[PDB]
Design an enzyme around this catalytic site. Structure first.
Site, PDB file in Angstrom:
ATOM      1  N   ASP A  23       0.837  -1.193   0.000  1.00 48.52           N
ATOM      2  CA  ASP A  23       0.000   0.000   0.000  1.00 48.52           C
ATOM      3  C   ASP A  23       0.875   1.247   0.000  1.00 48.52           C
ATOM      4  O   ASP A  23       2.097   1.152   0.030  1.00 48.52           O
ATOM      5  CB  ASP A  23      -0.943   0.003   1.205  1.00 48.52           C
ATOM      6  CG  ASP A  23      -0.204   0.053   2.531  1.00 48.52           C
ATOM      7  OD1 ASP A  23       1.041   0.046   2.526  1.00 48.52           O
ATOM      8  OD2 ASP A  23      -0.869   0.097   3.583  1.00 48.52           O
ATOM      9  N   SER A  24       0.241   2.413  -0.029  1.00 42.91           N
ATOM     10  CA  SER A  24       0.942   3.683  -0.111  1.00 42.91           C
ATOM     11  C   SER A  24       2.008   3.851   0.958  1.00 42.91           C
ATOM     12  O   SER A  24       3.152   4.265   0.658  1.00 42.91           O
ATOM     13  CB  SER A  24      -0.041   4.833   0.030  1.00 42.91           C
ATOM     14  OG  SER A  24      -0.932   4.803  -1.041  1.00 42.91           O
TER      15      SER A  24
END
Ligand SMILES: CCCCCCCCCCCCCCCCCC(=O)OC[C@H](COP(=O)([O-])OCC[N+](C)(C)C)OC(=O)CCCCCCCCCCCCCCCCC
Ligand SMILES: CCCCCCCCCCCCCCCCCC(=O)OC[C@H](COP(=O)(O)OCCN)OC(=O)CCCCCCCCCCCCCCCCC
Ligand SMILES: NC(=O)C1=CN([C@@H]2O[C@H](COP(=O)(O)OP(=O)(O)OC[C@H]3O[C@@H](n4cnc5c(N)ncnc54)[C@H](OP(=O)(O)O)[C@@H]3O)[C@@H](O)[C@H]2O)C=CC1
Ligand code: SF4
Ligand code: SF4
Ligand code: SF4
Lengths: 206, 176, 76, 154, 112, 292, 114
Positions: free
Chosen positions: C37-38
């Site tokens: 994820d980010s």
């Protein structure tokens, strides 16, 4: 009439005249001017006008409101802009007081007035802490009254009187801990308002 | 009208300059301060010999609460709940019902003495002089629970202290 | 040195627990292949910041989405 | 032998109650009335109660005023640094149980949630005399202590 | 010349008359850049000209102070500097323009 | 359920758990954790104590107003036991000493006193009884401490057959005489965390299937005593007591597979490595190898 | 739908501020665990930080995001400058709060709350 507070028409006229004076000079920002029956002058302005209106009242030769007496907020949830920002100023030169009011909501910053009055510094921190109104370009905006890490803004009408958490010392972890608040005796809400109108002069049209 | 507290120009005549030099070198004003504390050493102290001597109080003094009776022994309280309503700290909790003889009386009358601010508003609000703040101020306890007064405790306080309470009310009721 | 740089990038990434060692390839997108994820990518960049001893801004870091850009980025 | 233990308890108890050195948390209003207890009329020093003592030479902590949540951790730290034996006197409604701010979001509802308490002095504020009564009541509590008598019977 | 103004930080002015003429002239110069029909210009020119006339028409400082009603002449000079600073800012703010935005319908209604 | 002991609230300080507990030995190491967890959820706790009231002061903040009640008692006086237990729904016995005194030997603290508490509790009608024994209790142990624990463990099971008996290993924690014991200075040990033992005791009070059972509370890992003491010194950043105490420390921790443990009460054992520094930080001026 | 911005003029700019704040928090955890003598691991401290960010993942208002970052920066200032005490830092971990039941049956057994 011994029990009735006497009126003062001379002061009422002077303040009314100065109210028009201010509104003629700053039409860009002044939305409403009113004088109360006990002779207090209130200028209601668009929030964009905070710095120009306060600067004019501090510096103009017929104003000279050099002292910021108080700066606070009022939460009125029914309004679209629930927060009313109130500046109470004092002019020693003319021995007079004036109140300036604007408005904001949860997500709209207000320009910090520290540039006009250095007294505003801590007042705006208190408004941020107690109401959650953000002041833009404040030299140091942070909580001032609440405990570190405190969540929420207690002076909002929808914040509960006793809050959400309470503290105690816990022996197992050897420190003060925060836990959801339980009360041995709940605060007893009272419904005190009479169902009969008290003041016809303030009746709102239906 | 105003006055200046500290707007004075010292004289520069040699007699005055030498006066200030003597004060600087001989510490004269420091010596003058020693005289003041010395004079107190020989004054009678203001201390009183507690608990054999007591600080003076007035009949209005707001101390420990008590529930009072009529001369016949009937309780004065009629469970009107005006005291509970006015109490600034919500320190009063009352419940009531008709007594066996049909009288309007309380079944609960609690004062949380650790919520109370000893303001006297309850005794102002009472229409029958039932709840009073008495003259006792020496009722510190070893436990928190001992300061959570119920009706039995408050009635006992009234029976314990009524002799003094009545005389204090007698001396002040014409001011009320 | 370009393979020396390239080796270190794979060294740091292997230590990063969240990345399965076998899935890792020098041209593997963090968010498509490895399923990161980010904020997982943000931690990777701070690791590279530590290995190569220089600061990688957010505008630069937002584009380094596979080891190859990181190797490519360092070289510049 | 038990006669010896009874008299040593009396000796150490007499010394401890005759030399009570307090640390006052002057948190709020109630601090004013402890100042009046030190003032000439009551002169707490005449009982052996020095006016101000450092926390590390203190025997009794007097919590005189409202304890907020923000201050509670600091108060616990001071209590934990007190050499033993140590006692706590809670003075005033705020410290006793929260008092007039009992229903506040920011107030600890009684300092006994944070430290153990030996004496509760009621009042808002207790008079200087009422506080002095509580201090003399703490002295009587120390007089009842039987540490050596109980030690000898373990 | 007086020894002190009585106000901490406010120093005595040796030539107050010429200082005030310079400031009041500067204010009138700045007010010329404001539109002729802005209330701030009309009112500020009016008061500035009233004070300027008194300054030219009274050579004794304490007689002048009695006429200006602004406290110490050093306080009047400071007030002139404040007006000059404000006038410059007013040109950027242009508060004589129409109201930027109306408030919501019940924004100022009280009680609710 | 009597109306007074129906649970209410959300399990906090001002709630009503419905537990009315007498905790003998509450002023010791294990007692302070047990009383804390009882008062956390709003239980009525009766604390019989032999010591000075000054020495029970740390227990007062553990419960809301009125929830902690203190009583005098004498281990040899059965009337004082009856006063303490006749209103309780559960009795917890944590009485013990790691050494013997002129007035109380191991046969007193671990046999005579537990048996008297169990008997009076049975007579008074107490429903639940929780008795703390020891993992290594054994009538053939070289330790008079552990031999008495076996005799008393049997007498309680006979006197109050429905008693829940708990057999902990060495307990470590801030106030322990285990990790602290090493820091103040052949064998395999399986020490268990104090909070784990406390939670097990609390869950035994609630679990109805725990009645009449015997539990062994052990930690998640087994260690050689040498490897453990080495780890203690490393954590304490330090360069690397009665005769009966030494025998206990050298007794290997029994492995009783048939007994239920902490996982049978819903408690996950805490590894020593997570909590060792908590205990040993104050002693400051590589995890230990575990047996598979 | 025109409103006055706080800092960000859109979500892309708001997200850049979020990532800067996350980086500042991520790097400060090792110091916090040491200065405050915490009994948690650095991994636990960073896992908590990541948890706090994640619960706010659904926000799409750049003004709301701006306020969340403003409050996040103040929280970081209190920690870095040691205005907080150990108790304040550990309040993120609810170490004395026994887990509340989540499934329907467990909540049904204990009380009336949904
Ligand atoms: C080293 C030897 C020092 C001997 C100290 C003896 C102190 C004398 C003393 O105890 O005071 C009498 C005290 C005085 O009584 P008191 O301490 O209760 O005080 C009563 C007087 N007012 C009300 C004013 C406070 O007698 C006792 O209290 C009995 C305890 C005796 C302790 C000494 C045991 C020997
Ligand atoms: C023929 C020629 C012969 C030649 C020899 C002639 C010699 C005679 C002339 C010399 C006389 C000099 C006297 C010497 C005493 C010291 C004087 C002195 O130092 O005073 C100055 C000092 C500071 O003064 P200050 O106001 O701060 O300003 C000065 C700096 N700008 O002020 C101070 O020190 C203040 C002290 C503060 C402490 C105050 C507490 C003490 C107050 C009570 C003291 C009582 C005196 C004790 C007597 C001694 C007991 C044994
Ligand atoms: N801690 C451990 O490592 C393990 C402990 N246990 C058992 O757990 C129980 C408690 O452990 P712990 O709390 O560590 O023991 P502690 O010694 O810490 O506390 C013992 C308690 O027993 C009381 N007590 C001792 N002797 C007497 C007596 N003669 N009459 C009355 N009360 C007495 C003490 O009260 P006072 O303060 O008045 O002396 C104290 O409250 C004990 O039974 C112990 O054997 C079992 C396995 C492991
Ligand atoms: S004295 Fe005041 S606070 Fe106390 S019970 Fe009466 S009304 Fe309430
Ligand atoms: S004490 Fe007085 S005011 Fe209070 S309920 Fe009784 S009669 Fe009413
Ligand atoms: S108890 Fe009363 S006097 Fe004391 S701090 Fe509280 S409000 Fe003030």
């Amino acid at each position: 009439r011994p029990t009735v507070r006497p009126r003062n028409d001379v002061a009422h006229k002077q303040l009314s005249a100065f109210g028009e004076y201010v509104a003629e000079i700053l039409p860009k920002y002044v939305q409403q001017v009113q004088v109360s029956c006990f002779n207090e002058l209130e200028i209601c302005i668009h929030p964009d006008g905070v710095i120009p209106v306060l600067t004019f009242l501090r510096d103009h030769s017929n104003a000279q409101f050099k002292s910021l007496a108080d700066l606070t907020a009022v939460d009125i949830p029914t309004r679209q802009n629930r927060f009313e920002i109130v500046y109470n100023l004092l002019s020693l030169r003319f021995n007079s007081r004036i109140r300036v009011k604007t408005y904001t909501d949860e997500l709209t910053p207000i320009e910090s007035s520290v540039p006009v009055y250095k007294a505003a510094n801590w007042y705006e921190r208190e408004i941020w802490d107690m109401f959650g109104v953000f002041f833009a370009n404040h030299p140091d905006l942070r909580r001032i009254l609440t405990d570190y890490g405190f969540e929420g803004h207690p002076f909002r009408k929808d914040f509960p009187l006793s809050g959400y958490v309470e503290l105690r010392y816990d022996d197992e972890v050897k420190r003060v801990v925060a836990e959801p608040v339980e009360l041995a005796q709940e605060f007893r809400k009272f419904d005190l308002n009479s169902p009969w109108e008290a003041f016809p002069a303030y009746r709102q049209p239906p | 009208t105003y006055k200046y507290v500290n707007l004075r120009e010292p004289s520069m005549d040699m007699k005055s300059v030498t006066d200030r030099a003597a004060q600087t070198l001989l510490w004269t004003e420091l010596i003058r301060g020693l005289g003041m504390t010395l004079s107190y050493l020989f004054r009678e102290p203001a201390t009183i010999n507690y608990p054999f001597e007591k600080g003076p109080l007035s009949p209005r003094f707001r101390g420990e609460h008590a529930l009072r009776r009529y001369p016949s022994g009937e309780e004065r309280c009629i469970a009107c709940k005006l005291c509970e309503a006015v109490c600034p700290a919500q320190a009063i909790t009352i419940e009531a019902e008709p007594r066996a003889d049909g009288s309007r009386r309380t079944t609960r009358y609690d004062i949380d003495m650790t919520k109370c601010i000893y303001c006297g508003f309850c005794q102002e609000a009472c229409p029958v002089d039932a709840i009073v703040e008495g003259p006792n101020f020496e009722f510190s306890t070893e436990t928190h629970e001992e300061l959570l007064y119920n009706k039995e405790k408050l009635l006992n306080n009234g029976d314990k202290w009524e002799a003094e309470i009545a005389a204090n009310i007698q001396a002040d009721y014409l001011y009320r | 040195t370009l393979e020396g740089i390239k080796d270190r990038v794979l060294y740091v990434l292997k230590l990063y627990d969240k990345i399965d060692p076998e899935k890792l390839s020098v041209n593997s997108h963090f968010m498509k292949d490895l399923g990161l994820d980010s904020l997982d990518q943000v931690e990777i960049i701070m690791a590279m910041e530590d290995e190569f001893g220089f600061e990688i801004p957010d505008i630069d870091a937002e584009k380094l989405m596979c080891p190859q850009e990181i190797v490519d980025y360092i070289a510049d | 032998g038990e006669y010896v233990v009874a008299k040593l308890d009396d000796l150490i108890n007499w010394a401890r109650r005759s030399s009570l050195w307090p640390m006052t948390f002057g948190l709020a209003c109630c601090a004013v009335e402890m100042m009046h207890m030190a003032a000439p009329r009551y002169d707490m020093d005449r009982f052996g109660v020095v006016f101000r003592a450092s926390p590390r030479q203190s025997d009794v902590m007097i919590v005189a005023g409202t304890l907020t949540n923000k201050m509670a951790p600091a108060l616990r730290k001071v209590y934990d640094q007190m050499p033993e034996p140590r006692y706590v006197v809670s003075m005033g409604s705020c410290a006793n149980g929260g008092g007039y701010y009992h229903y506040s979001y920011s107030v600890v509802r009684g300092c006994d949630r944070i430290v153990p308490v030996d004496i509760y002095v009621p009042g808002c504020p207790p008079t200087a005399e009422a506080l002095l009564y509580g201090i003399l009541q703490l002295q009587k509590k120390i007089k009842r202590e039987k540490r050596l008598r109980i030690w000898y019977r373990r | 010349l007086k020894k002190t103004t009585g106000l901490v930080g406010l120093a005595v002015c040796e030539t107050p008359h010429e200082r005030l003429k310079i400031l009041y002239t500067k204010i009138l110069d700045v007010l010329g850049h404001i539109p002729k029909n802005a209330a701030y210009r009309k009112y500020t020119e009016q008061i500035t000209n009233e004070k300027l006339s008194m300054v030219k028409a009274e050579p004794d400082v304490k007689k002048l102070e009695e006429r200006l009603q602004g406290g110490q002449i050093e306080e009047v000079i400071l007030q002139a500097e404040n007006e000059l600073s404000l006038a410059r800012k007013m040109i950027q703010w242009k508060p004589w323009e129409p109201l930027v935005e109306e408030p919501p319908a019940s924004q100022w209604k009280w009680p609710i | 359920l009597h109306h007074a002991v129906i649970p209410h609230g959300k399990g906090g300080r001002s709630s009503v758990s419905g537990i009315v507990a007498t905790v003998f030995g509450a002023t010791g190491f294990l007692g302070r954790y047990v009383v804390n967890h009882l008062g956390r959820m709003g239980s009525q706790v009766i604390v019989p104590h032999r010591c000075e009231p000054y020495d029970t002061m740390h227990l007062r903040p553990m419960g809301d107003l009125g929830q902690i009640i203190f009583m005098d008692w004498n281990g040899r006086d059965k009337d004082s036991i009856r006063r303490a237990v006749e209103h309780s729904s559960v009795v917890i016995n944590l009485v013990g000493r790691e050494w013997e005194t002129q007035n109380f030997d191991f046969e007193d603290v671990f046999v005579k006193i537990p048996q008297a508490i169990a008997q009076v509790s049975k007579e008074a009608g107490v429903e639940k009884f929780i008795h703390i024994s020891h993992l290594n209790a054994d009538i053939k142990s070289s330790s008079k401490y552990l031999r008495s624990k076996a005799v008393g463990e049997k007498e309680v099971r006979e006197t109050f057959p429905e008693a829940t008996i708990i057999k902990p290993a060495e307990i470590f924690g801030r106030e322990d005489r285990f990790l602290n014991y090493f820091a103040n200075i052949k064998t395999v040990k399986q020490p268990v965390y104090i909070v784990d033992v406390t939670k097990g005791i609390i869950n035994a009070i609630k679990d109805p299937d725990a009645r009449g059972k015997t539990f062994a509370f052990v930690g998640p890992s087994r260690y050689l005593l040498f490897d453990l003491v080495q780890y203690v010194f490393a954590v304490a950043h330090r360069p690397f007591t009665t005769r009966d105490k030494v025998e206990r420390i050298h007794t290997t921790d029994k492995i009783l597979p048939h007994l239920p443990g902490l996982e049978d009460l819903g408690v996950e054992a805490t590894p020593l490595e997570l909590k060792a520094i908590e205990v040993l930080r104050r002693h400051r001026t590589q995890p230990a190898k575990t047996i598979p | 739908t025109s409103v006055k911005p706080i800092f960000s003029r859109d979500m892309n700019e708001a997200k850049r501020r979020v990532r800067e704040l996350y980086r500042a928090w991520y790097r400060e955890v090792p110091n916090t665990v040491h200065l405050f003598q915490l009994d948690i691991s650095v991994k636990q401290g960073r896992d908590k930080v990541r948890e706090m960010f994640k619960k706010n993942a659904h926000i799409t208002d750049p003004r709301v995001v701006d306020l969340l970052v403003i409050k996040g920066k103040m929280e970081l200032e209190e920690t870095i400058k040691v205005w907080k005490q150990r108790t304040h830092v550990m309040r993120f971990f609810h170490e004395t709060e026994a887990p509340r039941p989540k499934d329907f049956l467990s909540k049904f057994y204990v009380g009336h709350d949904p």
